[PDB]
Each structure stands twice: as structure tokens, then as C-alpha cells.
Design a protein around this ligand. Structure first.
Ligand SMILES: O=C(O)[C@@H]1CCc2c([nH]c3ccc(Cl)cc23)C1
Ligand SMILES: O=C(O)[C@@H]1CCc2c([nH]c3ccc(Cl)cc23)C1
Ligand SMILES: [Ca+2]
Ligand SMILES: [Ca+2]
Ligand SMILES: [Ca+2]
Ligand SMILES: [Ca+2]
Ligand SMILES: [Cl-]
Lengths: 360, 358
């Protein structure tokens, strides 16, 4: 196995396959030269990233595996415009560039683990920006290491011509739907949180569309010369329609950033553990208050657009702040029911995403 | 106690000054001025804010982080009105209102009174240069408490800083245009850190006052006071190589990148790399317990006898990152002697690294 490639053609592929073990070979990248292509594979047994690099210079076929981080750190450490000559010699991989020479240990390619083979049941294409939008709008609401394993991940749902993401930790929910202009079956799967992070990581910028394949136990995303494959999560994800308030007809509208800074200041004097704040809504006005065990108190009063009846309601302020930070918009709509029911929150200008927060 | 001040006039003082009372700030309105004091019993920062708006005298202490966070959270340009109300401190700005707990100003601890024995003034930029050049070589929580800080030494018209962790050494000296007594003190590392951040590098001169057990630095509206480390510092002069007659000179960044690349395949604990020096050429090699190997060859300026020497690559990279210059000189003797490292174009800072037998 031999190849010579430009540093700049190696960097991003290495970065993509490198991110991230007790089982050593999982710390290695599989390198394959075949049919004028270098393939770079990294895996953790649950998910897999494969990058393909075209070889325009002389090369020889073969396969090996090398320490991922070390190989990446060596390539990144080399100067702008460096040319990187690699060859398998003995049980070592030789890396040469200029007068820099490196000899890395290898583990046999035959030892590199493969995911189980599977069949694609559902397929579609969508813009990179759309997938980015879907993930960023909901990602923050996924659970972290909850015993309900199905919540430590993100639902991806196809319905009509819409792709939808749902994330919830049992206390708050985020949902976002986008048109992708294809007739899709009605289907949903849960992608593990690590898979979601990796999927987000591969976009990227630029105008490369994303190709998605969904199997009974796997998801695959093709973008450019990268292929990401993940296992799915078992379990019955909650139905976002049961979480959305059935009729939240008390509509409050306020500047997103003004609203956020008011909640953030009030948050300073909220209970450090429970983070509770009270909202007092009345005609065109919102009052936010907070207090802690040591009798410290915050009060914020804002002008808002509100014509409904007056009500009081308590919330975990971090949850509200999460939502407002996730809304990169000018105005927010808060949709209320009563003092003991959840609130729906949306961008005043768009219904594409919805956020639900339970009262305290 | 009562005052009304613009948010932005509080932010820098608050940043600078930031038992539970040690988590509070002492606030004092007196003679047209707001004073804010923070302390951890070892050191203290006092900031002064001129009060152009109507005010009423008094003193209290409030939670530092909360009060800072409230002020920083309010909108740019906001006016912040503060008054005492029983056991509480009221903070108002627009339609935002905050009631904070207080602890008595009488309970706020003071550093012991002391006499200034040695004094000098120097540009802030000079003090910043002195500390930056050496700071990274201070020990962290070493049993030898006298190394967990930085030596400040006066001699003739020069101020010198020394820092060592018992393994490598940094030294920096600058003339300051004033005749000084021959003296030296050890400033605790947290004190060094605080002093550093008190300096904007600007046009306000820095006044330093040193007592038998304390040091004080005054810059414009800020006064920093710290206890000294009461111990003996090692003599730096004994560690400098007697007569290093083998000077290698090379571009700092190229030298650094070569070492940083070779370091990847060096021992993770002991970080030894080898140098082979020959006429106008340097070869760096590294290997680890897995027998992975790195080699770097680069052009340098060198005309001395051919030699080989090993160093901790982490220590050398620290030096090269601190130097931030165009060209570096490595002053070599032999394989069993330490190396002195300097900016090729300045003797003001010098760094010593021990030899390694690899
Ligand atoms: O499977 C579960 O335990 C559900 C997870 C999602 C969820 C449950 N109760 C909720 C109440 C409010 C919100 Cl926002 C989400 C949930 C229960
Ligand atoms: O008091 C001590 O223990 C000394 C601290 C300074 C020091 C010791 N051995 C060293 C070796 C190299 C350098 Cl640069 C400093 C020291 C021992
Ligand atoms: Ca209703
Ligand atoms: Ca509260
Ligand atoms: Ca002296
Ligand atoms: Ca070595
Ligand atoms: Cl080699």
C-alpha cells in the first residue's frame, strides 16, 4: 500500500473520520487503497464514518489501520501545502513529507470491525441547510443518559413530504418539520445522540445535497465523499402531538432578545437547583419574578403584545432560556392555556419549530 | 448608602475585584467616591469609581458573583441605582429590580497594616513583559511552597523576575530607570496572576511598594495588595550554563513546528526528544514505548562542534511559545549540560532546560 496526497485533501477527511478505547483497534483508522481511491474508515461499533479521497498520483493497493489521533496530529502538524507520502513497510506505516518522517504502528486490516449488512427501506434527498435546521432546532432538548434510553436521541420522522425531528427529555420538547419535496412513506426512527452529533458534524457548508437511507436498524447519510452509518435506538418515542397543548389560545408576543435578557437576569436570583421563575401575564405586560432560599428577589417588567385574560405560571428558567437561545429570531410567541398546563413557544414569524415546556 | 452609576463604569472595577464574606464585595461610598473591595485573606483588590451623580455615604458587603452578573446582565448604557434597605441591598435599573442579601461591612476582613520599604514606578507594559516571560515556569501546589510563586528582584536600575518548578527555569530582566536597593521577594502565584490581569498595559504608570511581608501595586483607580511567600528562593545563577559556546539559531516557528510534530511520537510521561546538531543542520528524533519513531531535519545557523543532546520536548515548546519572536538561539555546551534558550535578538529573557539521557 502506497499513496502520495496533498495535506489539504487529507485534513478534512481525517477530521471527519477521527472524531472521537479499551479495545485498541477502535482507536485506529482503516486505510484502503483500491481502484485509484483512498478510503478512510473510523468506527465505535455503533456508528461508522467513511471518507473517499481520489488518488491522482501514483499509488499501490492495500489496506492497514493506524492510530487515528496520531496520524491526524501528524498531518495537521505539517505545513500548509505539504505533500504527504505514505507507504506500508514491515509492520509500520511510513509517513513522509519534506524532511519530516514518521513511523506508526499498525493493526491488521482484517481485524477492523464491520457493521452488519442491511437493506435500505426508506430513501430521500434534502439540502444540507435543511438537515442543519432540523438538528439545531431540536438537539438541545434530547435527554442526557436518561434510563428511558429512547429519549437519549432524536426522532427523525417522515410524513407526507416533511422530514421532522423531535427531541424531549420528559420535561421539555422541541419539534421541527421541513418540506423536502419528495413523496415519503410515513415512518420514524430514533437516532442515538452520538449519531446526531456526528450527522451534524458532517455539514459542512457548501452546496452538496444530503442523501439519506433508512433501514430497520440503521441510518446512513451520504454527503459529498463521506458516508456516515449509525445503528438506531429501540423503543416507543413519545408522540409530539400529545405534548403540544391542544388549544393554547392565549398568545403573548415579545422581542426574543429582550425577553431572554430579562429571564437571564431574573435567573440569577432563582433557586440554584430548581431554577424556578414566575410569569405574571396581563394586558400588554409581562412580569417575571424570582427568589431563592435566602430571600433574595428579582423582578423584571416588560412590554409585550397580549390581549388574553390574566394568569400566573411558574417555569424552570433554564428550559425557557434554552428555547429562546435556540430561536434565532426577532419576535417570539408564547402560547398559553392555564397556570397548570404546558406552554408552547414559537418564532412569531415561523411555525416550522415548536417548543413545549411544562409548568413547575 | 446610595449611589447611581453607569453600568460600564462598574464592569472593569467589578471584574478586577472579583468564609462566605470572602465571596462578598465590600462597597463604600465616601468623599465623592465608590470603593469596591475583594479579598481572599491572602490578597486584596480595591477599585475606585468617581461618583458624578448624587450619592449618600455608607458601607455594606454583597455577593460578588451575583452583583457582577446582575450588572453585566443589564443593557449596555443602563444606569444602575443602588441603595441599602435594612439587611438588603436594592439594585434598580429601568424596570428591573433586585434585592440582594448583605453581610456587615464591619465583618469584612482587613490585611495587616505594614510599612513600605522599597518603591519604584515603571510602565505597565514592562511589568506585563516581566511576568509573561516567566509565569509558565512557576510550580503549582508543590510541597516546596517557595516555588509556588515568582521571584521579584531589584538590582541597580533593573527589575528581574525568576520562575522555576524545580525542573526548568525562566528569567527576565528589564532596566527601569531608577536606582534600587539589592532586594528580592517571592510573590505567590495567585498574586502574580491577579497582578497580571490588573494591567491593561496603558498609559497609567504602575507604582510598586514592597514591605518585609507584603507587596502592593497601584495603577490609576486600582490598588492590589498581597502577602509575600515567606521562604528562600533558589539562586538562578547556579543553573545557567557556565560557558555555552555552541549557538544554534533558527526561525522560532519552524523550530516549534518541528518539535511539536516530533513530540507526537515521544514518550507520553517523560517526553524526551533527541537533537543531533551539525553544520547548519538540526535533526530531531523521538520514539515511544510502542517503538513508533519521528524524525525532523531542518536548516539552521550552526557552526560549532557536532553534538547530540536530549530534552523534555514539553519544556522546550513552553519556551518557544513564550518567546513569540522571529528567531531563537539555543545555547549549547555538550550532551551532559543544560541548554539556555533566548530570543536571538534579545538577552532580556533566558530559559534553562535540563539535558536528558535517552
Ligand atoms: O416516555 C416518556 O416517559 C414520555 C417522555 C416525554 C414526556 C413525557 N411526559 C412529558 C411531559 C412534558 C413533556 Cl414537554 C414531555 C414529556 C413522558
Ligand atoms: O529547593 C529545591 O528543591 C530546588 C528547586 C530548584 C531546582 C531544584 N532542582 C532543579 C533542577 C533544575 C532547575 Cl531549572 C531547578 C531546580 C531543587
Ligand atoms: Ca384553551
Ligand atoms: Ca422563584
Ligand atoms: Ca539583588
Ligand atoms: Ca525519543
Ligand atoms: Cl523514522
Amino acid at each position: 500500500m502506497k499513496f502520495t496526497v496533498e495535506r489539504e485533501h487529507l485534513l478534512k477527511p481525517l477530521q471527519q473520520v477521527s472524531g472521537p478505547p479499551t479495545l485498541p483497534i477502535l482507536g485506529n483508522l482503516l486505510l484502503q487503497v483500491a481502484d485509484g481511491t483512498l478510503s478512510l474508515t473510523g468506527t465505535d461499533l455503533e456508528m461508522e464514518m467513511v471518507a473517499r479521497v481520489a488518488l491522482v498520483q501514483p499509488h499501490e493497493p492495500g489496506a492497514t489501520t493506524v492510530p487515528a489521533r496520531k496520524f491526524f496530529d501528524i498531518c495537521r502538524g505539517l505545513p500548509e501545502g505539504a505533500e504527504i507520502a505514505v507507504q506500508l513497510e514491515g509492520e509500520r506505516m511510513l509517513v513522509r513529507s519534506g524532511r519530516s518522517r514518521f513511523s506508526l504502528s499498525t493493526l491488521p486490516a482484517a481485524d477492523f470491525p464491520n457493521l452488519d449488512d442491511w437493506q435500505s427501506e426508506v430513501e430521500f434527498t434534502l439540502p444540507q441547510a435543511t438537515m442543519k435546521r432540523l438538528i439545531e432546532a431540536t438537539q438541545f432538548s434530547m435527554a442526557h443518559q436518561d434510563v428511558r434510553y429512547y429519549l437519549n436521541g432524536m426522532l427523525f420522522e417522515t410524513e407526507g413530504e416533511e422530514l421532522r425531528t423531535v427531541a424531549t427529555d420528559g420535561h421539555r420538547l422541541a419539534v421541527c418539520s421541513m418540506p423536502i419535496g419528495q413523496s415519503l412513506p410515513s415512518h420514524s426512527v430514533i437516532v442515538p445522540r452520538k449519531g446526531v452529533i456526528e450527522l451534524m458534524r458532517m455539514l459542512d457548508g457548501g452546496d452538496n445535497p444530503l442523501r439519506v437511507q433508512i433501514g430497520s436498524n440503521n441510518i446512513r447519510a451520504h454527503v459529498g465523499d463521506f458516508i456516515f452509518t449509525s445503528k438506531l435506538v429501540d423503543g416507543r418515542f413519545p408522540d409530539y402531538r400529545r405534548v403540544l397543548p391542544k388549544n393554547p389560545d392565549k398568545h403573548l408576543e415579545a422581542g426574543c432578545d429582550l425577553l431572554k435578557q430579562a429571564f437571564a437576569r431574573a435567573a440569577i436570583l432563582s433557586n440554584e437547583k430548581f431554577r424556578g421563575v414566575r410569569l405574571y401575564v396581563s394586558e400588554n405586560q409581562l412580569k417575571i419574578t424570582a427568589n431563592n432560599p435566602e430571600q433574595e428577589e428579582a423582578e423584571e417588567i416588560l412590554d409585550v403584545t397580549y390581549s388574553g385574560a390574566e394568569m400566573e405560571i411558574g417555569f424552570n428558567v433554564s428550559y425557557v432560556l434554552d428555547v429562546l437561545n435556540a430561536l434565532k429570531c426577532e419576535n417570539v410567541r408564547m402560547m398559553l392555556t392555564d397556570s397548570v398546563s404546558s406552554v408552547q413557544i414559537e418564532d412569531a414569524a415561523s411555525q416550522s419549530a415548536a417548543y413545549v415546556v411544562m409548568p413547575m
